[PDB]
Design a protein around this ligand. Structure first.
Ligand SMILES: O=C(O)C1=C[C@@H](O)[C@@H](O)[C@H](O)C1
Length: 179
């Protein structure tokens, strides 16, 4: 049906916790008639444990080693839209897999909106802290250049229909390519 887009590369969404990666990703996949996967959810599926449990029992290092293995595998698939984890771009091998194996889109999201969308979400181990706003801010200061460097496209998002943002991303990508 949208076999029309079968030769379009994988699309990889990057950005912080609360960027709407999975809601936008799933709409973008539906628009393209292809698969959608969330690497956070795939890590949980493959491990049989939640991400808080991985962080507690294996540390952040054990989460990163599991995440890199999953990303290596998922970026080798075809016809995918992938929502990546918020800290996936902290590791050099992941930056390379993403940049070199499809189209990377950075969902730039202000801290205010990250905060609202992760409000009392206990599944985000890094935000289980007294001051989650400062944490998000600190994380963004570090990771914003990394999101931008891996990204082919950056879209400065804001409160809205995830499906409107998915449309916009698809327009951006094709704008380039159809001329
Ligand atoms: O910002 C981060 O480093 C993380 C974001 C989440 O998507 C998970 O991938 C995990 O909680 C770590």
């Amino acid at each position: 049906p949208s076999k029309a887009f079968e030769t379009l590369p994988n699309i990889y969404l990057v950005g912080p916790m609360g960027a709407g990666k999975t809601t936008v990703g799933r709409h973008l996949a539906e628009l393209l008639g292809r698969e959608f996967l969330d690497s956070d959810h795939e890590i949980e599926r493959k491990t049989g444990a939640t991400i808080p449990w991985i962080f507690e029992k294996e540390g952040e290092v054990g989460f990163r080693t599991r995440e890199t293995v999953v990303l290596n595998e998922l970026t080798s698939r075809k016809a995918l839209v992938l929502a990546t984890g918020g800290g996936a771009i902290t590791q050099a091998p992941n930056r390379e897999f993403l940049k070199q194996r499809g189209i990377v889109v950075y969902l730039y999201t202000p801290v205010e909106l990250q905060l609202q969308r992760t409000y009392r979400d206990k599944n985000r181990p890094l935000l289980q802290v007294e001051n989650p706003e400062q944490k998000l801010r600190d994380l963004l200061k570090i990771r914003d250049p990394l999101y931008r460097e891996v990204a082919h496209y950056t879209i400065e998002t804001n409160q809205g229909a995830a499906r409107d943002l998915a449309q916009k991303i698809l327009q951006l990508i094709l704008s380039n390519k159809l001329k």
